[PDB]
């Protein structure tokens, strides 16, 4: 017989196919071509077009799609559309397998849904375990979407028990305009930032943080999204910046590294964009979780062969007779995939047991620096040390602003011919100290003067210098 | 039945076949988002009475909300914190959307001297005593309880028994 | 308790006679009494307790019966005087028969006495056996008394028959 796995995807008008849509098409063709998994069922897709956040049409296509009869409906990747189809699938018995995080309210009495994006009750614990490891005190959470507070719940709280000085800021609705925000972070000394965005807006927020000179070794970033490896970090590979994140897309096994490599070839027909900071042809996370969405229900239909696809009706509330059994086999699956272990939680169809791999920005790109289980905490690796090991050109590619004062043995204007500009307008002892410090460290330097005239002393009634 | 977004969509289509002029739709956000998506697609006005988090990508024209915007009230509470000269507060909210309802008060330490210490009630009702005992210790004198009035009465019954009505 | 300032709040006129050796105590020790007296009414203790909150009367030696020892603490809760600052010594022997359920988590440290020998199983059985014909009549719930316990006035009349029976 033939199963009829459904699915809702946003189509770009004349943009070829959605990235999640390309996964769900190709992951069905993987099961049909490899008869090791499901040798006798031959799955079939029913992909429909859905407008950006239109909950009626997501209710309209799905009631049309349950008239065709499906065995599962793969979710609308939005939030207002997903809350609709979750309630269609609950009232008619069909499972509703989700791929992205919606705001789950505390009181939906629904059973027929599983989320495959990992829960932010566990992610916001994994952010704070990075904060506790780095021994920060001045965290500067920057979100972009209004539900980013929900995503960082356990980090917005705990200045209570874990003594922080959290300061919360929001990117405006001018989406590529983090310039007025980053001007307010350069002043006020916000060097420890927990940018909570998508990787599209995590790319363009770094190009605006490079041109402002906020990409020096003073700064440290703990980007929240599970897509940090899909950024072109080559402009930032040699700047000395700390840049920490996560990765759930397992890129370690020779098995799963082929699937990314196989379908980077396949979505090469899908044309890229200009230099928007992100690398081309990466199965980011959304096509990875939709890939795992096909398999975990495919290991559920394997353990339950007596299935049909009943042509259900929206008007009559006759539940799909196989529904309660087929939902219980989805929630009791453990089938491994791209994003690691895909075990579910009971008492809610979420994913609170998963395997993150903490990544960092080093001189060789983005490298794994540890791992994180929800019941094993943050297992960081041991650098264990190397050596200083020829400090001679460690500060190469740098640029430093040096401030001096005229002092006749140490700094004097070079009293000579026609006007000397740049660094040649100074001479003395500690100017000649820079000339043999820039030799032994290899940086560039611009001697500014002070504007005040002074050397530094505390104001008695104010405290400033 | 609220907490059910598909019965909210069927009874809306039953009224629109019956010929209503305006749906005064339900209270909960999972149901009211489904009703205004119907009321947008069929022209008919939806008139809301409760707070609902409008996603900023809902390009939707046919809804009005008579519940006052928490853009305004979280600037109203931030005025009272400054009128009372406070320097340390404790936002005790109730359910997960309380962080969304109080954005302009949580974003306030970025611009003022105010120093928030955000907390959250449990799923239960009379289990607020392990929370209030953790507020007595640590000297949490100034509290910005974000609850409904059903649970605003419930906390003060525990806050009396903890000896926190001083 | 290392006290240096108390406030004897007695109930009727003979409370001065009942507490001679505590009123005569500033003559010999460092203790500094500030004797007060409840009104003729019951719920009129709030003008007294408001005059004790002002003046910082932290340490109180209420001399009342247990009927009015429950009545003051109901006003002393409503005045916000059940805190971790305040400390009450009750002179009655029926302290153990008060409803301390709304006062247990307050932070208060109510001290008193108890002459009932409620450790021995012989004594504890007679208190149980007496409760059967006492629960035949219902009490009022608003009083604030844990019903079923055997009061000191009932206990001494039980002992008065036996000490003559011996
Ligand atoms: C970016 O990534 C780099 C590495 O990739 C991280 O580097 C760390 O740099 C900091 C300093 O900038 C090191 O900080 C440690 O601080 C500890 C606190 O104790 C000192 O604190 C006061 C000031 O508050 C000092 O005045 C005083 O001297 C105290 O000692 C220390 O315990 C650390 O000392 C360590 O080194 C000495 C020898 O130097 C040894 O005895 C011990 O190994 C000791 O642990 C140190 O001073 C931190 O060690 C660096 N981590 C590394 C190299 O892994 C950055 O954190 C990261 N982020 C940013 C924003 O740059
Ligand atoms: C900022 O300053 C840094 C140095 O401080 C410069 O960054 C790179 O530094 C690395 C190592 O320090 C260099 O990497 C080596 O490159 C060799 C080939 O050279 C380059 O050739 C062309 C240019 O002609 C480039 O297109 C190409 O990408 C290469 O980078 C490789 O042979 C080396 O590989 C192996 O070397 C040894 C010996 O086998 C092994 O032990 C190593 O493990 C390694 O596998 C090595 O990769 C590199 O040359 C530097 N420059 C780059 C990448 O441009 C930056 O240049 C400087 N910033 C700017 C903007 O210039
Ligand atoms: C299914 O989901 C529930 C709801 O999240 C899980 O319960 C949660 O379990 C975690 C541990 O995995 C607990 O979190 C606690 O965090 C604090 C802060 O660090 C720590 O002090 C505690 O020791 C504990 O780690 C907590 O019991 C609970 N969290 C809730 C209810 O918010 C449950 O574990 C999941 N089932 C699984 C994964 O099998
Ligand atoms: C956190 O760190 C690692 C994450 O990989 C966990 O596994 C441990 O990995 C090290 C490798 O450096 C193992 O050490 C050696 O492994 C080899 C190969 O098996 C073995 O032959 C050696 O005798 C030596 O043990 C280590 O055993 C391994 N731990 C295990 C398997 O339990 C590590 O367990 C994590 N947890 C902790 C608490 O460190
Ligand atoms: C009521 O109880 C508390 C704690 O049980 C006591 O006050 C503190 O605890 C010890 C034990 O008596 C004292 O030695 C400390 O000096 C007390 N702390 C302070 C800061 O004074 C005490 O038994 C009672 N306290 C009150 C205020 O009634
Ligand atoms: C079929 O899929 C299974 C499960 O991933 C894998 O072990 C096997 O190698 C695959 N076979 C082929 C021929 O691709
Ligand atoms: C499933 O496939 C096996 C062959 O691997 C076959 O024996 C069996 O009949 C199939 N089940 C069906 C067709 O229901
Ligand atoms: C180490 O430092 C010396 C100092 O000038 C430098 O000449 C040399 O190239 C460096 N590297 C090695 C491998 O010696
Ligand atoms: O895993 C969630 C959380 O559980 C517990 C704590 O001890 C942490 O170490 C850990 O992060
Ligand atoms: O101590 C507070 C802590 O105790 C227990 C855990 O299960 C958590 O849910 C809770 O936050």
Swiss-Prot record, chain C:
Positions of glycan attachment: 109
Superkingdom assignment: Eukaryota
Tissue: Highest expression is found in the olfactory lobe, piriform cortex, dentate gyrus, hippocampus, granular cell layer of the cerebellum, and in caudate-putamen.
Post-translational modification: Sumoylation mediates kainate receptor-mediated endocytosis and regulates synaptic transmission. Sumoylation is enhanced by PIAS3 and desumoylated by SENP1.
Record localization: Cell membrane; Postsynaptic cell membrane
Further comment found in the protein's record: The postsynaptic actions of Glu are mediated by a variety of receptors that are named according to their selective agonists. This receptor binds domoate > kainate > quisqualate > glutamate. It does not bind AMPA without coexpression with GRIK5.
Subunit-structure text: Homotetramer and heterotetramer with GRIK5. Tetramers may be formed by the dimerization of dimers. Assembles into a kainate-gated homomeric channel that does not bind AMPA. Can form functional heteromeric receptors with GRIK4 and GRIK5. Can form functional heteromeric receptors with GRIK3. Interacts with DLG4. Interacts with NETO2. Interacts (via C-terminus) with KLHL17 (via kelch repeats); the interaction targets GRIK2 for degradation via ubiquitin-proteasome pathway.
Role according to the record: Ionotropic glutamate receptor that functions as a cation-permeable ligand-gated ion channel, gated by L-glutamate and the glutamatergic agonist kainic acid. L-glutamate acts as an excitatory neurotransmitter at many synapses in the central nervous system. Binding of the excitatory neurotransmitter L-glutamate induces a conformation change, leading to the opening of the cation channel, and thereby converts the chemical signal to an electrical impulse. The receptor then desensitizes rapidly and enters a transient inactive state, characterized by the presence of bound agonist.
Similarity section: Belongs to the glutamate-gated ion channel (TC 1.A.10.1) family. GRIK2 subfamily.
Designated name of the protein: Glutamate receptor ionotropic, kainate 2
């Amino acid at each position: 017989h033939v199963l009829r796995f459904g699915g809702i995807f946003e189509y770009v008008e004349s943009g070829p196919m959605g990235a999640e849509e390309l996964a769900f098409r190709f992951a069905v063709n993987t099961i049909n071509r490899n008869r090791t998994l499901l040798p006798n069922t031959t799955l079939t897709y029913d992909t429909q077009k859905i407008n950006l956040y239109d909950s009626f049409e997501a209710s309209k296509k799905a009631c049309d799609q349950l008239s065709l009869g499906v065995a599962a409906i793969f979710g609308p990747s939005h939030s207002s559309s997903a809350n609709a189809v979750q309630s269609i699938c609950n009232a008619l018995g069909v499972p509703h397998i989700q791929t992205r995080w919606k705001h789950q309210v505390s009181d939906n009495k629904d059973s027929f849904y599983v989320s495959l994006y990992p829960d932010f009750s566990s992610l916001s614990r994994a952010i704070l375990d990075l904060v506790q490891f780095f021994k920060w005190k001045t965290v500067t959470v920057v979100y972009d979407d209004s539900t980013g507070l929900i995503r960082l719940q356990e980090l917005i709280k705990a200045p209570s028990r874990y003594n922080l000085r959290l300061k919360i800021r929001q990117l405006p609705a001018d989406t590529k305009d983090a310039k007025p925000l980053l001007k307010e972070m350069k002043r006020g000394k916000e060097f420890h930032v927990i940018f909570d965005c998508s990787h599209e807006m995590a790319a363009g927020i770094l190009k605006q943080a490079l041109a402002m000179g906020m990409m020096t070794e003073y700064y440290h970033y703990i980007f929240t999204t599970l897509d940090l490896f899909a950024l072109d970090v080559e402009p930032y590979r040699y700047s000395g910046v700390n840049m920490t994140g996560f990765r759930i897309l397992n890129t370690e096994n020779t098995q799963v590294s082929s699937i990314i490599e196989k379908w980077s070839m396949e979505r090469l027909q899908a044309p890229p964009k200009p230099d928007s900071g992100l690398l081309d042809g990466f199965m980011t996370t959304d096509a990875a979780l939709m890939y795992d969405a096909v398999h975990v229900v495919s290991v559920a239909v394997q353990q339950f062969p007596q299935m049909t696809v009943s042509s259900l009706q929206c008007n009559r509330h006759k539940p799909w007779r196989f529904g309660t059994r087929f939902m219980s086999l989805i929630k009791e699956a453990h089938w491994e995939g791209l994003t690691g272990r895909i075990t579910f939680n009971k008492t809610n169809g979420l994913r609170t047991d998963f395997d993150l791999d903490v990544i960092s920005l080093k001189e060789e790109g983005l490298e794994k620096i540890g791992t994180w289980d929800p019941a094993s905490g943050l297992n960081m690796t041991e650098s264990q040390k190397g050596k200083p090991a020829n400090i001679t050109d460690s500060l190469s590619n740098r640029s430093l602003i040096v401030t001096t004062i005229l002092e006749e043995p140490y700094v004097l204007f070079k009293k000579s011919d026609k006007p000397l500009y740049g660094n040649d307008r100074f001479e003395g002892y500690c100017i000649d100290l820079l000339r043999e410090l820039s030799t032994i460290l290899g940086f560039t330097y611009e001697i500014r003067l002070v504007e005040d005239g002074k050397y530094g002393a505390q104001d008695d009634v104010n405290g400033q210098w």
